Amino acid sequence: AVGIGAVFLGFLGAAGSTMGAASMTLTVQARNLLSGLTVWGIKQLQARVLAVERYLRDQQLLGIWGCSGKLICCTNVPWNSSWSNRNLSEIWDNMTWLQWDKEISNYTQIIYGLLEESQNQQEKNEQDLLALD
Amino acid sequence: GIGAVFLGFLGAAGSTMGAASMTLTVQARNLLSGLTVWGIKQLQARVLAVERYLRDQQLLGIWGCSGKLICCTNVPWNSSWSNRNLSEIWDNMTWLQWDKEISNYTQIIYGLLEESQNQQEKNEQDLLALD
Amino acid sequence: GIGAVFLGFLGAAGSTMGAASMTLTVQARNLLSGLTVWGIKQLQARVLAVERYLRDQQLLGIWGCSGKLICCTNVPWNSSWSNRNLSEIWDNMTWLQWDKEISNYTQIIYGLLEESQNQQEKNEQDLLALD
Amino acid sequence: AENLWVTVYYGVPVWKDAETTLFCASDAKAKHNVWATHACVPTDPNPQEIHLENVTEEFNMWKNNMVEQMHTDIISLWDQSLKPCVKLTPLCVTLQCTNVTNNITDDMRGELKNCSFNMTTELRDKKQKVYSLFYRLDVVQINNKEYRLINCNTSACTQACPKVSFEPIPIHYCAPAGFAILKCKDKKFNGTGPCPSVSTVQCTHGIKPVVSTQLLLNGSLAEEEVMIRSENITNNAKNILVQFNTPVQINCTRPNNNTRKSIRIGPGQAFYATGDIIGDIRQAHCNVSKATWNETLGKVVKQLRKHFGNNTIIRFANSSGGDLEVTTHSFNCGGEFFYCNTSGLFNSTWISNNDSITLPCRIKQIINMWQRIGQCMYAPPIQGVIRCVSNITGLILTRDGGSTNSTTETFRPGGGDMRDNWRSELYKYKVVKIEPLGVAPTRCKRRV
Amino acid sequence: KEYRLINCNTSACTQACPKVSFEPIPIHYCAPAGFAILKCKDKKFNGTGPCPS
Amino acid sequence: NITDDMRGELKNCSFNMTTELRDKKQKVYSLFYRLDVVQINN
Numbered sequence: 001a002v003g004i005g006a007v008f009l010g011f012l013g014a015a016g017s018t019m020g021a022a023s024m025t026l027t028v029q030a031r032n033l034l035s036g037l038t039v040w041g042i043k044q045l046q047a048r049v050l051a052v053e054r055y056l057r058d059q060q061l062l063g064i065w066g067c068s069g070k071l072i073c074c075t076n077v078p079w080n081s082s083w084s085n086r087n088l089s090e091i092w093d094n095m096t097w098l099q100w101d102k103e104i105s106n107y108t109q110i111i112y113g114l115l116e117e118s119q120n121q122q123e124k125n126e127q128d129l130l131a132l133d
Numbered sequence: 134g135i136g137a138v139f140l141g142f143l144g145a146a147g148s149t150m151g152a153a154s155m156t157l158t159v160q161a162r163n164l165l166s167g168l169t170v171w172g173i174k175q176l177q178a179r180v181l182a183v184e185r186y187l188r189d190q191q192l193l194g195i196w197g198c199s200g201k202l203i204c205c206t207n208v209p210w211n212s213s214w215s216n217r218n219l220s221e222i223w224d225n226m227t228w229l230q231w232d233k234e235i236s237n238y239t240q241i242i243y244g245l246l247e248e249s250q251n252q253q254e255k256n257e258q259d260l261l262a263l264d
Numbered sequence: 265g266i267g268a269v270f271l272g273f274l275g276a277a278g279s280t281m282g283a284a285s286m287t288l289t290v291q292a293r294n295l296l297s298g299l300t301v302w303g304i305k306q307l308q309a310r311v312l313a314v315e316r317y318l319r320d321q322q323l324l325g326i327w328g329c330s331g332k333l334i335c336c337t338n339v340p341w342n343s344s345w346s347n348r349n350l351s352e353i354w355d356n357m358t359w360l361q362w363d364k365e366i367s368n369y370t371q372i373i374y375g376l377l378e379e380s381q382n383q384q385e386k387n388e389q390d391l392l393a394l395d
Numbered sequence: 396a397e398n399l400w401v402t403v404y405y406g407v408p409v410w411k412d413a414e415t416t417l418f419c420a421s422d423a424k425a426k427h428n429v430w431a432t433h434a435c436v437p438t439d440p441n442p443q444e445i446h447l448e449n450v451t452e453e454f455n456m457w458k459n460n461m462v463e464q465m466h467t468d469i470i471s472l473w474d475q476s477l478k479p480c481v482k483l484t485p486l487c488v489t490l491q492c493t494n495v496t497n498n499i500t501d502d503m504r505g506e507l508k509n510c511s512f513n514m515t516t517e518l519r520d521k522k523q524k525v526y527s528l529f530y531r532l533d534v535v536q537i538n539n540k541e542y543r544l545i546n547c548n549t550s551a552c553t554q555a556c557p558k559v560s561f562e563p564i565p566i567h568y569c570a571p572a573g574f575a576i577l578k579c580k581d582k583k584f585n586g587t588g589p590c591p592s593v594s595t596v597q598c599t600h601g602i603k604p605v606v607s608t609q610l611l612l613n614g615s616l617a618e619e620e621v622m623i624r625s626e627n628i629t630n631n632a633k634n635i636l637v638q639f640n641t642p643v644q645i646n647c648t649r650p651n652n653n654t655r656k657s658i659r660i661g662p663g664q665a666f667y668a669t670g671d672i673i674g675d676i677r678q679a680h681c682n683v684s685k686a687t688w689n690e691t692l693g694k695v696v697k698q699l700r701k702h703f704g705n706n707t708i709i710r711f712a713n714s715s716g717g718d719l720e721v722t723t724h725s726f727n728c729g730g731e732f733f734y735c736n737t738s739g740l741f742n743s744t745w746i747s748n749n750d751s752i753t754l755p756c757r758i759k760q761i762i763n764m765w766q767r768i769g770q771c772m773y774a775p776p777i778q779g780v781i782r783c784v785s786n787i788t789g790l791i792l793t794r795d796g797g798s799t800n801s802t803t804e805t806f807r808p809g810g811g812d813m814r815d816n817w818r819s820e821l822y823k824y825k826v827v828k829i830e831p832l833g834v835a836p837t838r839c840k841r842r843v
Numbered sequence: 844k845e846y847r848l849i850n851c852n853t854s855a856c857t858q859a860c861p862k863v864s865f866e867p868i869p870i871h872y873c874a875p876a877g878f879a880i881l882k883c884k885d886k887k888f889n890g891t892g893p894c895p896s
Numbered sequence: 897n898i899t900d901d902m903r904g905e906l907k908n909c910s911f912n913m914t915t916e917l918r919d920k921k922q923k924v925y926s927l928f929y930r931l932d933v934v935q936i937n938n
């Protein structure tokens with residue numbers, strides 16, 4: 001996360017690295033997702049709108065999962081073995097995030113709904129707990 | 134239990150405030166994505182959606198409720214705003230009906246929330262100084 | 265303050281940094297609301313406002329100060345940036361005056377904040393993996 | 396225990412009436428079109444519609460902003476489509492017109508004029524003596540005899556591009572994220588008042604921008620009964636919108652076997668003139684079955700007696716008067732613009748107790764759409780015979796102010812405003828603005 | 844000897860503005876934030892198939 | 897009925913102008929201030 005002894009850190013630098021290794025370079029990708037009449041002017045305006053839209057699309061999902069302002073955020077949703085039966089070592093040491101995305105693509109929407117429901121339940125439970133004071 | 138018949142955008146609009154509070158993520162997730170004449174309307178629509186979402190997010194942020202669906206605050210409820218009981222608000226009212234009631238007092242509540250959040254931040258800074 | 269004559273956009277621009285720090289929400293709440301070329305120019309202005317707000321929010325996030333008006337940090341103050349006393353900063357000058365003084369050293373502080381947040385995130389991750 | 400605190404909820408299901416810039420969506424299956432569809436976002440092949448249980452919403456079919464916005468968008472698309480087409484400025488020249496009398500029926504006597512004129516050639520220093528066939532409605536005598544196009548003292552007509560099709564294509568009006576469209580699923584809704592059955596959709600159903608004056612064609616039909624909708628039924632100055640539960644098929648044709656002549660009036664500019672009709676010349680007309688029309692009119696009368704007494708005599712009369720665009724059932728049958736005399740349709744009296752109707756239609760080529768002045772369009776002739784079949788989905792009736800103890804009510808057709816055509820479709824839709832941020836009292840208190 | 848311009852039966856030519864220059868100036872095509880452009884650094888790439896570098 | 901200070905300021909100009917019909921011209925006249933017209937070279 002702070003790159004002690006890293007050869008070099010750059011946008012998508014750890015794209016071919018394993019998920020475990022690429023998980024220590026999230027800051028590198030995260031900080032480049034927002035910064036980087038004539039025909040060109042319209043194209044630039046469309047590009048800016050697209051960038052804002054794409055950034056906010058992920059930011060909203062992070063917000064409604066309770067992971068706002070976090071790069072690695074643990075959740076209360078247990079991992080259903082049906083989504084992927086590979087061992088933890090088989091995922092974080094012998095696989096890359098690009099390969100992983102191709103495996104859990106079919107189950108992404110199911111996971112997202114579970115995360116949203118879990119966050120809502122956590123918020124309600126916290127409200128109830130605080131109401132006892 | 135978790136046995137919702139079906140969850141959809143605004144599906145709980147007719148349910149009580151208590152029951153509709155369990156479907157916040159249903160609405161929250163559809164607030165961002167539910168030249169020619171048609172080419173400019175689409176761009177304006179996209180920009181407008183982004184602006185509205187960011188306005189709501191900013192209001193949440195300055196209240197200390199950033200990244201929260203149900204956020205509790207330190208602002209006591211004023212009986213002037215609404216004298217109805219808690220039981221008759223969360224079990225005999227829909228959010229649509231409630232909104233039409235606390236509308237002349239929404240700006241007052243927003244200002245109170247902002248002031249309280251600022252005071253909380255200042256107090257937290259003061260306390261951290263001692264440590 | 266607890267009881268103020270009036271709170272307005274940039275109203276505390278002339279107050280000392282200590283007093284102007286109790287009106288952060290006043291400025292924060294006004295940073296977002298305010299075929300032809302006129303439509304395109306308006307769209308550019310609105311998009312620019314959105315981009316500036318998002319850039320400020322991202323800067324706060326990468327420092328670990330997400331959704332906070334006043335956020336304490338782990339970066340010590342280097343006297344080279346400014347040698348003024350705490351009392352002579354928070355009770356004898358305004359934010360405008362302060363900004364003109366540390367304008368040169370602003371990017372250095374931003375980079376230090378980002379790197380410090382990176383170190384804090386590494387420490388958090390290592391501690392979590394330890395358990 | 397009795398102390399309550401403000402709690403902020405994000406995503407609460409709340410909304411407010413609002414006006415926004417709805418964008419269009421079109422079916423992928425649907426070369427260029429006036430209502431530019433290649434620029435429309437593809438529709439969702441499986442539209443999502445959420446049933447809002449317990450929700451009662453107030454709709455206003457007559458103060459609906461989705462109609463004015465649609466009108467503006469339709470006009471803008473028309474202008475955009477006409478922008479690149481040929482401008483018929485040179486066509487405003489003296490014409491030496493003579494009657495067409497080659498195999499003409501008595502009805503179509505003097506309706507067609509054979510005009511010859513000098514027209515600019517591709518070279519600026521050469522002229523060509525050409526001739527064209529013009530309908531009497533398009534030429535005005537200057538005073539064999541000298542004529543001029545009707546528009547020559549108002550504006551220069553812009554020829555419609557022959558490769559741009561006027562055929563209406565369904566348009567789905569979608570709302571931006573953070574906005575919603577509420578659909579009134581009530582089957583007996585009369586356009587105004589609360590709707591007890593409401594559902595939210597992101598895009599409306601495919602609405603065809605059909606342009607007609609007296610009869611609503613190719614529209615959506617009522618589910619149960621003929622629905623009479625009016626902003627104020629008592630007021631006689633407000634139009635009455637009738638929606639049929641079953642369609643009335645109308646066959647419209649232009650029997651003449653037209654021939655198209657391409658006259659090159661300049662570099663890269665061609666004027667598509669009518670040539671000679673191959674065969675006899677006969678009037679254009681529309682057919683509606685007498686039995687079906689009488690059944691639908693009886694249903695309309697039965698539903699009208701609800702608002703106008705149980706024994707009042709309901710009689711239908713033809714249009715009072717005015718220009719051809721309001722006294723006739725105007726439409727566009729695949730390129731050709733018809734103006735049918737609907738006097739046989741609305742002629743009857745109903746007491747409290749096989750064949751076909753042929754409507755004689757007239758064709759025009761200089762069209763003043765949207766009731767605008769100074770902006771006319773020239774419709775190029777369509778080669779060959781023309782024949783289209785449509786459904787009379789509804790009517791736009793008007794009532795006469797019969798005072799002095801009038802036991803009879805007279806309804807006559809009336810068009811005019813084109814918004815009433817869109818209104819017949821966007822009557823169950825309304826745009827709302829979502830308000831995800833809500834504050835309510837709770838026993839919960841923040842932790843310090 | 845009567846002639847006419849080649850285009851007179853197809854369109855009217857628009858004279859190019861004499862001040863405007865036709866010289867090709869390099870254009871760098873940039874992708875918006877959230878998008879990236881991947882460059883195939885392989886020296887023997889034939890335009891199709893995987894690019895190892 | 898002109899004053900000595902307005903001598904030559906207004907010019908009575910006659911010209912051929914296009915009609916609504918591309919093949920017909922009309923002879924019309926108008927009053928133009930001397931500051932608007934330039935002699936070409938009654």
Ligand SMILES: *[C@@H]1O[C@H](CO)[C@@H](O[C@@H]2O[C@H](CO)[C@@H](O[C@@H]3O[C@H](CO)[C@@H](O)[C@H](O[C@H]4O[C@H](CO)[C@@H](O)[C@H](O)[C@@H]4O[C@H]4O[C@H](CO)[C@@H](O)[C@H](O)[C@@H]4O)[C@@H]3O)[C@H](O)[C@H]2NC(C)=O)[C@H](O)[C@H]1NC(C)=O
Pocket residue numbers: 426559560561562563605612613726727728729730778779782783784785786
């Ligand atoms: C209500 O709805 C009904 C049906 O939904 C409508 O009736 C339809 O009307 C359309 C248009 O009038 C008609 O489509 C035409 O059918 C003709 C006969 O099959 C075709 O010949 C014609 O094709 C020519 O015109 C097209 C226009 O865009 C061109 O794109 C096409 O290339 C053809 O033109 C070329 O070919 C001809 C002949 O070779 C040549 O002369 C030309 O120069 C050119 O080269 C259309 O496809 C439908 O068939 C009708 N459907 C039915 C069931 O009747 C009705 O019009 C609607 N009512 C209202 C008021 O809108």
Ligand SMILES: *[C@@H]1O[C@H](CO)[C@@H](O[C@@H]2O[C@H](CO)[C@@H](O)[C@H](O)[C@H]2NC(C)=O)[C@H](O)[C@H]1NC(C)=O
Pocket residue numbers: 494495496497509510511526671672
């Ligand atoms: C319209 O008038 C034109 C003439 O202005 C007719 O075309 C001419 O018809 C005569 C007799 O058939 C021919 O001898 C000529 O060669 C034709 N061409 C010209 C340029 O004169 C045309 O037939 C008339 N059309 C109708 C429908 O009456």
Ligand SMILES: *[C@@H]1O[C@H](CO)[C@@H](O[C@@H]2O[C@H](CO)[C@@H](O)[C@H](O)[C@H]2NC(C)=O)[C@H](O)[C@H]1NC(C)=O
Pocket residue numbers: 494504505
């Ligand atoms: C030729 O066309 C003219 C112009 O439309 C018409 O002349 C009219 O003929 C009818 C029948 O007699 C009468 O109204 C008048 O005698 C004419 N004047 C009009 C209509 O203003 C008619 O269609 C044709 N007449 C002839 C002689 O060819």
Ligand SMILES: *[C@@H]1O[C@H](CO)[C@@H](O[C@@H]2O[C@H](CO)[C@@H](O)[C@H](O)[C@H]2NC(C)=O)[C@H](O)[C@H]1NC(C)=O
Pocket residue numbers: 489490491511512513524
């Ligand atoms: C089209 O142009 C021809 C010739 O350019 C016109 O014919 C002229 O008509 C005037 C009328 O007084 C005569 O004085 C000329 O001698 C004619 N010239 C000829 C026949 O070469 C004709 O009037 C114009 N209009 C049309 C054809 O409708």
Ligand SMILES: *[C@@H]1O[C@H](CO)[C@@H](O[C@@H]2O[C@H](CO)[C@@H](O)[C@H](O)[C@H]2NC(C)=O)[C@H](O)[C@H]1NC(C)=O
Pocket residue numbers: 535548549
């Ligand atoms: C363009 O010309 C038409 C026909 O010559 C004019 O229409 C006539 O206008 C006069 C106005 O004095 C009316 O008395 C007639 O009843 C009109 N007749 C028809 C058939 O419309 C029209 O007014 C002219 N328009 C302009 C702007 O001059």
Ligand SMILES: *[C@@H]1O[C@H](CO)[C@@H](O[C@@H]2O[C@H](CO)[C@@H](O)[C@H](O)[C@H]2NC(C)=O)[C@H](O)[C@H]1NC(C)=O
Pocket residue numbers: 627628629630631
């Ligand atoms: C519907 O129309 C009727 C008739 O136009 C309106 O009733 C009229 O109201 C005006 C306003 O005071 C009176 O001067 C008339 O005498 C009334 N006429 C009749 C026949 O009642 C009625 O108000 C309209 N409805 C609405 C909702 O505006």
Ligand SMILES: *[C@@H]1O[C@H](CO)[C@@H](O[C@@H]2O[C@H](CO)[C@@H](O)[C@H](O)[C@H]2NC(C)=O)[C@H](O)[C@H]1NC(C)=O
Pocket residue numbers: 646647648680681682751753782
């Ligand atoms: C509209 O109806 C008329 C009348 O039934 C049709 O005209 C008849 O057409 C047939 C041939 O199809 C002839 O044998 C009859 O003599 C015609 N009758 C008359 C009175 O002219 C007409 O074809 C129909 N057109 C459409 C488009 O439906």
Ligand SMILES: *[C@@H]1O[C@H](CO)[C@@H](O[C@@H]2O[C@H](CO)[C@@H](O)[C@H](O)[C@H]2NC(C)=O)[C@H](O)[C@H]1NC(C)=O
Pocket residue numbers: 652673779780
């Ligand atoms: C309208 O007229 C055209 C032109 O005559 C007809 O098209 C011709 O039809 C014949 C019929 O066998 C063919 O042999 C020709 O090849 C066609 N094209 C021509 C002559 O250019 C057309 O059929 C007519 N339509 C009708 C009468 O409905």
Ligand SMILES: *[C@@H]1O[C@H](CO)[C@@H](O[C@@H]2O[C@H](CO)[C@@H](O)[C@H](O)[C@H]2NC(C)=O)[C@H](O)[C@H]1NC(C)=O
Pocket residue numbers: 644645646682683684685751784
């Ligand atoms: C309108 O036209 C349709 C055909 O385009 C007519 O339907 C035909 O009617 C005849 C006469 O009964 C039948 O023999 C055919 O089988 C029918 N065909 C179809 C496809 O329906 C219809 O009758 C016409 N209606 C009117 C009022 O003219």
Ligand SMILES: *[C@@H]1O[C@H](CO)[C@@H](O[C@@H]2O[C@H](CO)[C@@H](O)[C@H](O)[C@H]2NC(C)=O)[C@H](O)[C@H]1NC(C)=O
Pocket residue numbers: 713714715716722736737738
């Ligand atoms: C409407 O129907 C009537 C009768 O069927 C048509 O007859 C004319 O009616 C007007 C009254 O508005 C009279 O002034 C005329 O004398 C009548 N005769 C004629 C030949 O016009 C009337 O034309 C029809 N109008 C329309 C627009 O269809």
Ligand SMILES: *[C@@H]1O[C@H](CO)[C@@H](O[C@@H]2O[C@H](CO)[C@@H](O)[C@H](O)[C@H]2NC(C)=O)[C@H](O)[C@H]1NC(C)=O
Pocket residue numbers: 736738739
């Ligand atoms: C519409 O059609 C009706 C009849 O179908 C027309 O009324 C007839 O008009 C003619 C002259 O145009 C008269 O000779 C008849 O006596 C009229 N009959 C009836 C029953 O009124 C009417 O004029 C047409 N509308 C127009 C032409 O605008």
Ligand SMILES: *[C@@H]1O[C@H](CO)[C@@H](O[C@@H]2O[C@H](CO)[C@@H](O)[C@H](O)[C@H]2NC(C)=O)[C@H](O)[C@H]1NC(C)=O
Pocket residue numbers: 738739742743
């Ligand atoms: C309007 O309807 C009336 C009543 O049916 C029509 O009047 C009759 O029309 C028939 C058809 O030719 C005649 O045989 C009768 O003599 C008419 N009776 C009258 C005038 O009392 C009238 O023609 C219709 N008008 C239209 C269709 O325009």
Ligand SMILES: *[C@@H]1O[C@H](CO)[C@@H](O[C@@H]2O[C@H](CO)[C@@H](O)[C@H](O)[C@H]2NC(C)=O)[C@H](O)[C@H]1NC(C)=O
Pocket residue numbers: 613642784785786
């Ligand atoms: C006009 O009405 C006819 C008749 O109701 C419609 O034809 C129906 O179309 C649907 C779907 O295309 C079929 O399932 C029905 O079987 C058809 N009915 C009959 C009697 O064949 C037609 O779709 C309507 N719309 C248009 C534009 O004609």
Ligand SMILES: *[C@@H]1O[C@H](CO)[C@@H](O[C@@H]2O[C@H](CO)[C@@H](O)[C@H](O)[C@H]2NC(C)=O)[C@H](O)[C@H]1NC(C)=O
Pocket residue numbers: 852853
């Ligand atoms: C525009 O004119 C050119 C030259 O006259 C046309 O090109 C000729 O077209 C004929 C058509 O039979 C050919 O035989 C020649 O070989 C062509 N020569 C050249 C040099 O192109 C051209 O087709 C015309 N274009 C249009 C749209 O009419």
Ligand SMILES: *[C@@H]1O[C@H](CO)[C@@H](O[C@@H]2O[C@H](CO)[C@@H](O)[C@H](O)[C@H]2NC(C)=O)[C@H](O)[C@H]1NC(C)=O
Pocket residue numbers: 903904
């Ligand atoms: C008629 O107008 C002309 C144009 O202004 C004037 O004539 C002379 O114009 C010249 C050139 O501007 C001046 O230098 C002279 O002073 C003008 N006057 C004379 C007498 O030469 C003058 O206004 C009028 N001249 C007439 C009517 O002879």
Ligand SMILES: *[C@@H]1O[C@H](CO)[C@@H](O[C@@H]2O[C@H](CO)[C@@H](O)[C@H](O)[C@H]2NC(C)=O)[C@H](O)[C@H]1NC(C)=O
Pocket residue numbers: 910911912923
């Ligand atoms: C307007 O046009 C007319 C005729 O086209 C011009 O008058 C002609 O002028 C020429 C020489 O310039 C004479 O040879 C002719 O005899 C004239 N004819 C007539 C009928 O006058 C006139 O000069 C033009 N300019 C103005 C201002 O009228």
